[model samples]
Structure formats: structure tokens, C-alpha cells
Target: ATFEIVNRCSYTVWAAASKGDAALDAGGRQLNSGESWTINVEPGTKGGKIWARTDCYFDDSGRGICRTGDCGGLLQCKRFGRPPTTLAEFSLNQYGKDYIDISNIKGFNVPMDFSPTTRGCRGVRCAADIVGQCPAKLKAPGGGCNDACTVFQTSEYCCTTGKCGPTEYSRFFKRLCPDAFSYVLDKPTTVTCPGSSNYRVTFCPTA
Candidate 1:
């Protein structure tokens, strides 16, 4: 298993898991803020479990690990599951006198006859940002409704074969947002107090 510790903070030290395909014991090691480690399981006829741990967090966070490969045994197909469904809906946040808004997310296409009701957008909830057994990784330019977002990066693709490996942007869009060009009407916006009493607000899609 490959482990990469992404540090989104200002500090340097950290603690990360040593075993890639096993459980991590919570109270064994100490790591700084921006540190990571990796390990490989010895291949053999016999197989078993492994474990590791990470540094304590101000928000009290933690993570787990698992192993996979050709010699990893008679792989359990059911072990790899699909991403979770997260319903999409518009939300309005009051910032002083301005408004902050974000909306329009889904896992499936929008129906022909649909509307954005109070509950959520009229479409299938979007699965988490994970495609198939492996997380989504895309790098392409041109051709799509969200073309403006030329340098976009997101793991919102499911494991599917296509024009580009197992993830064609077109197929991914159809699977996640069927009516992406039409149904996903709500755009992302932000409203903030610039300095004086004036409020700076901007509304636009990621694209």
C-alpha cells in the first residue's frame, strides 16, 4: 500500500501509519504536523492483519489502512464498495447583509421532469469523491459543460472504463450529473466584508 501524508497546516512534525494493509493502534507512536510514512507487506502463502497509528490532532482526527495486490489473496469483491450518496441542495448563509451560497451536487443524472424543491435538487444524490475501487484521478482539457474549469481536479469519478482509461469525463458527468448543463443551475458564491461597511459578494460556478 502507498501512504502519502498531506499536511494542510503550518507545522512540520507528525505521526503516520507504518503498515499499509492493517489496523493502526491508536496510542503507539507520535508524529509531527506534516509527516508521513509507508510500508509493504511480505508476500507469502499465509495472510493476516497489520496495524499502525497517527499523531494526535487538535480536532482529534484518525485514519485506517488496508492491503491490496495480485498476491494479496483471493480478493473479496464485496470488500470494495461504492461511494456514499450525498444529497445536493442549495444553501444560503447570511454574511453581514450579503449572502454566501453553494449548491447543485449529485451522483446520478437529473430526470427529464424535475425541479429543485425545498428538500434538495431534483436528481440522484452524488456518491462520495471516490471512483470504483481506486479514487478518481483525471487530467484532461476541453469538451464539457464545465469547460471553464479547465484545470480542475476532483476524485468524483467511479471505476468505469472509458476513452481515458476507466474515467471519461463525459461518462463521469452522465453518471454523476445527468443534466449537468441544465439541472445544476445553482452556482457557488461567497459574500464577505471587504473593509469598510461595503460588502463584497461574488457568485459563480467552479467552472
Candidate 2:
């Protein structure tokens, strides 16, 4: 499957994806505004995720610190990103289908659309200005929206125990991004696509 990442922001976004059998796009890309990159996602890829790292300058070796979604300071990420990151997740060729999701469960740094190109499959988008609407306590330094758990760390928001429920902060994100996971327990946010379906992940989606 090929995953196309399109950047709509006026600034450059360093796109990052987690490991698969091979490092798709060499784990990251430097995409300027209006530019797009396509990564070849191998079949049977599991736990694959895509995010954008912002406000960074990589040296000749690809080591740099990003204000948002930094992945071990590597130009080619081999690990998960840090907090306050919007995620487009994918589990491909699992059994007979594929699953995709726009997830703010970790938090949100940018607007996103995660959609299948195949006909009849649903798409999930989170294109609201989450950073602009972030609650005072839930605002991260780099214009990312910090999840309640990331800020308060209470059992109510953290789900430290079994079966934790939603809180006021969860509702805040849900209201804006109804199709994305605002909290850990959300399930309806997930969308299914046929196996071998290609996908598009747009950042700063206009609609």
C-alpha cells in the first residue's frame, strides 16, 4: 500500500512514520507547503503510525530537536514520537482487512485527514484548530494541545486503572474532532478499509 502524505500548512513539516518491515520514506520526510510524499507501506504492516514534527532544523546527519512530535531526535525515526502529537494510525493486511484512524489520543499538534482511496470505505478527519481552542492547562509550548492526562495526570483522565470514563477535557476534543479518538477508550473513531487500499494523510486539511 502506498501512503501519500500531503502538507497544506504554509510552513514545512517533517513527516515521520514508525517502523514497518522496512522504514517507509526512510522513516521521515521534509515536506514544504503544498508538497506531498508517497511512502510504500508494506503489506502486513502493524502498529504503523504517521505524524508531523514541527519547527525543526536537521543537521547533515538528521539529528535535530522539534518543538512537536520529536522522535528521538533522529532524522529517520525508529521509535514513537513524543507527546502532543496528532497521529494517523494504520494496521494493514490484518486478517482480511485494514484499519485506519485519526487519533488525538496522545494529543494534537496539527489538523489531519486519514482516508482510504477505495470506494465505500469511510474516512476520519480532525481538521479543527485544536491548538487555538486548547484549554489553558492543556496547551503545550509548541502550539500543541496537551491531553488532560498529559497535563493533569489524574486517574480520571489517565485511565490508570480499569474502565476509566471520559472527563470534561475529553469532551472538549471530542466536540471538535468527533471522528477522531479524543480519549483512550474511544472505539467508534476507527474506520475500516479493504486490504491493499491506498491512503492519503493530509496535514492542515481545508475540508
Candidate 3:
């Protein structure tokens, strides 16, 4: 399986993901405006993810920091990067087709589009400026939209102790990017679009 990630943002972005308990995208790639990267995945792989980090500097061995989706300050990521960032999420089984979606579970650090090329499926996109409209409390320290679950630290937003429900804050995020899987209680976020073969994750994409 193959995936393409594009950086359409005006600034630079460092991509992050986990591979074999190692960093996918080779930990990080400094993708400047209009740059992109390609990745291959095993069909058996599932619960895959891709995200962008901004304002970072790393050493040769991948030591340093990223402002938004920093994964323990390593240029080469070892864990799923932290939130307040946009996500390119995908799922695949060795014998089945791939499924892809754009998620805001970690909150919106960047606008994005996740689309399949072969299918007639509508690509998932969040064209709105989520970080711009973010609630003051949910604003990322380095500029982005942080998740309420982390900010509030209560089931009201965490949905860990009880049935999760949307709060005013959640609704705000939903309104801007309805296509995203934002709420803890949100379901039906997955879609059947032939993602196994090829897909594109565009940052700062159009609606």
C-alpha cells in the first residue's frame, strides 16, 4: 500500500507516525511549502496514522523539538505524536481494502484533506481555520487547537468515565469540520473508500 503526504501550507511541516515501534516517515521530514513524501505500508497494518508538526529543529540523531505535534522531542518519532494537530488516519487488513479519514481527535493544528484517487468518495477536508477559531482555553501553546479532553481533564470532555457527549466546545469544533472525527463519543467516522492502493494527505487544503 502507498500513501502520499503533501505540504500545501505556507510554512514547513515535519511529518510523524509509528512504524514497527519505530518512527514512520523516518521520524520526520522537513517538508517545505509544496513539498511531499511517499510511504509504503504492509497490508496487514491497521490503525495507521500520519500527522504534521511545525516550528522544529532536530539533530542528526533526531534530537530536538517540534512546536505542535512533538513526539517526545525526537525528530524521529517513537510514539504517536501529541495532540493539537491534524491527523491522517487509515486502516487496512491484508485481505481487505483500506479506509481513510481526517481526524481532529487530537485537535486541529493544521487544515487537511485525506482523499482517495480511484474512488468517487468525497475527500475528507477541513478548510476552516480551526486554530484561528479555537476557544482561548483550547488554544495550543505554540499555535493550534488543543483538545478539550486534555484541557478540561474531566469525563465531560474525556468521556472515559461515562457516556461521552458533545459540549459547547465540541460543537464548535464540529461546526467547522463536520467531516472530522472530533468528539470522544463520535461514531460512523469511518468510510469505505478504496484507500489501500493510493491516497493523498494534503495540508492546508481547500474545502
Candidate 4:
């Protein structure tokens, strides 16, 4: 299996991913405008996620900071990307199917699209400019928009302690990107397809 990470934005983006205990190929790297990097994912890999880090400054030592999607200042990213950031999640080869989704449950830093390259598999994407329309309350200091759960931390927004339901804040995200996971209780956002299907994960795709 593989994931083709494309950068269609006008500027450069640091594409990042986490492969759990699988392979080291699912790591972070720079992708200039119109550039793409293909990562060979291990079969039966689980808990893998892809994201983009912007406004980064890395040295030869591979240590730096990312304005968004920072992973403990590590360019290789041994862990998941920090939010507010867009995400493409995958659970490959579970039973006989693969589960995938574009998730904004953590928040949104860049526009993203996740689609299957194989036939007969549905796709999910969130290409909205959430940063341009970010609400004042959930606005990030550097850029992008923060999720209500990250901003409020209330039971209503965070959906903690059985206090789970879509609030007006989450509805805002859902309205713009209906296919993405807006909160913890988000349902029907996951796309299931046959195992071994490759995917294209694009950042800042044109409308």
C-alpha cells in the first residue's frame, strides 16, 4: 500500500505522517509547490495518519519548529502532528477492508483531500478555507482555526463524560466540510474500501 502526498499550494509545505510501529517511510519532509512524495505504507498498518506542517524552520540536525502541525520539534515526527491541523487517518487491512477519513476533529490548518486510487472505493475530503473564516474564539495565533473542543474544553465542546453532541461550533465546521470528522462523536465520516488500495492525500487542492 502507498499514499501519494501532493502539494498543490502556492508555497511549500512540510508533509508529515505517523506509521506507528510499521515503517519509517511515513515521516515528514518538504514538498514544494506542485511537488509530491509517495510513501510506501506497510501492509496491515494501523493507526497511521497524514498531515501537513507549515511555517517550519529546520536545520541540518532535523530539529526545528512548525507554526502548525508541530511534532515535538522533530522533523521525523516519532509521534502524531500537533493541532490545529488537518488530518487523513487510515486503518489498513482490518478484517477485509480499509478504513480512511479526513478529520478536522483536532482542527484545521490547511485544506486537504483524501481519495482512494482504486476503483469502487468512496473518498472523503475537506478542502474548505477554514483559516480565512475562522471564528474569533477559535482562532489560532500563528494561523488556521482551532476546534471548539480545543478552545472551550467544556463538556459541550469536548464531548466528555457522556456530554457528547454537536454544538453550534462543530456545526460550523460540519457546514463547511461535511465529509470530515468535526468532533469526537462525528459519525459516518469514515470511508471503507477493500484492503491494499492506494490513496492520494493532497494539501491545498484547488476547488
Estimate, for each residue in 1-207, the C-alpha lDDT of model 1 and write its tens digit: 121222222332222221224422221223333333332212220112111111123323322221211111211111211111111221122232222121222221111111222222222222222223211433111111221122243332321232222234444543444433212322222223211121111111111
Better of 2 and 3 by TM-score: 2
By lDDT rank, best first, the candidates go: 4, 2, 3, 1
The 10-residue segment with the lowest total lDDT in model 1: 198-207
lDDT of 4 by residue, 52-149 (tens): 99999999999999998988888877788778989899999999889999888889999998999897688788988888888888899967798998
The full ranking of all candidates by TM-score, starting with the best, is: 4, 2, 3, 1
- TM-scores, all candidates, are 0.20, 0.94, 0.92, 0.95
lDDT for 32 (candidate 4): 92
| Lowest lDDT 10-residue stretch of candidate 3 | 19-28
Expressed as tens digits, the lDDT of each residue in 58-119 for candidate 3 is 98887888888888988777777877878888776535666777777778898888887666
lDDT of 2 by residue, 55-146 (tens): 97789988988899888888787787887999998899899899888878789998998888667598889999999999888999886998
Instruction: Provide the overall lDDT of each model, using Cα atoms, as 2-decimal numbers.
Output: 0.23, 0.86, 0.79, 0.86
**Model 1 whole-model lDDT (C-alpha atoms):** 0.23
Off by over 4 Å in 2: 19-23
Worst 10 residues of 4 by lDDT: 19-28
What lDDT would candidate 2 get against the real structure? 0.86
